[PDB]
Amino acid sequence: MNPPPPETSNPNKPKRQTNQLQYLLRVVLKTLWKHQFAWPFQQPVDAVKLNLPDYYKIIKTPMDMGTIKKRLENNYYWNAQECIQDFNTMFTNCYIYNKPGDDIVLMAEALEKLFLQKINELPT
Ligand SMILES: CCN(CC)S(=O)(=O)c1ccc(O)c(NC(=O)c2[nH]c(C)c(C(C)=O)c2C)c1
């Protein structure tokens, strides 16, 4: 069945507000969230509902934009690179589990390109 979703808070970790973190939420995440192809990435893969019994056998480091959004809202991330890493993991999982030309792969590609375009303008 499904694992618990990734942690979206850490009570043991100090919190900070930064221009980069705020940009990641309000510009980067927000723009990807609203793309027509965002929906498969807005929540963890529900392998039970979707009947994908091997998904969590193959994908041991799941990640999704719903988790990333909550992490940003919760100040889970101290370093902006942590957030960027989570995006990378999310896209990479898609390329691990699926095949060239699958709908989901084409959707990930479009989102990843948009991600690159938005991160390009990450503030210093
Ligand atoms: C419409 C309502 N849903 C979304 C809110 S849904 O019912 O959960 C729903 C219905 C049908 C679906 O095909 C999905 N698919 C996915 O989400 C999804 N995402 C990723 C990253 C993958 C893989 C395998 O990489 C898959 C299969 C989700």
Side-chain angles (χ1 to χ4, degrees):
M1 295 193 65
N2 297 314
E7 322 165 356
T8 56
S9 70
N10 192 337
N12 288 319
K13 187 171 168 189
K15 297 164 172 60
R16 67 177 175 180
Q17 174 181 63
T18 75
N19 194 197
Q20 293 182 332
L21 288 169
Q22 185 144 309
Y23 183 94
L24 285 160
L25 176 56
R26 302 197 180 181
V27 180
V28 181
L29 181 292
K30 190 170 77 192
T31 304
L32 270 67
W33 194 263
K34 294 188 157 98
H35 193 276
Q36 59 172 334
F37 297 158
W39 66 267
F41 304 98
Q42 286 173 338
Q43 62 288 308
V45 175
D46 186 335
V48 175
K49 175 165 62 34
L50 302 179
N51 197 3
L52 305 175
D54 294 322
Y55 187 82
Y56 290 109
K57 296 182 195 187
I58 292 149
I59 301 299
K60 301 302 198 183
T61 70
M63 189 50 58
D64 66 278
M65 289 202 301
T67 294
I68 293 165
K69 183 173 91 201
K70 284 178 182 208
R71 289 179 166 194
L72 291 157
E73 290 170 335
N74 288 345
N75 312 289
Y76 180 91
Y77 301 121
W78 181 263
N79 292 322
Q81 183 62 215
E82 297 177 81
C83 175
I84 296 168
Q85 182 177 148
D86 279 350
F87 275 103
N88 184 252
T89 297
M90 179 184 82
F91 298 123
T92 304
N93 290 339
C94 191
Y95 309 142
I96 294 165
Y97 184 81
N98 305 282
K99 308 303 195 203
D102 286 352
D103 288 349
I104 192 83
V105 173
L106 281 264
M107 293 165 93
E109 288 168 16
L111 292 169
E112 188 176 21
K113 290 212 313 86
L114 181 57
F115 176 72
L116 296 185
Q117 294 167 341
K118 297 281 100 190
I119 284 290
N120 185 37
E121 317 162 82
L122 188 73
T124 167

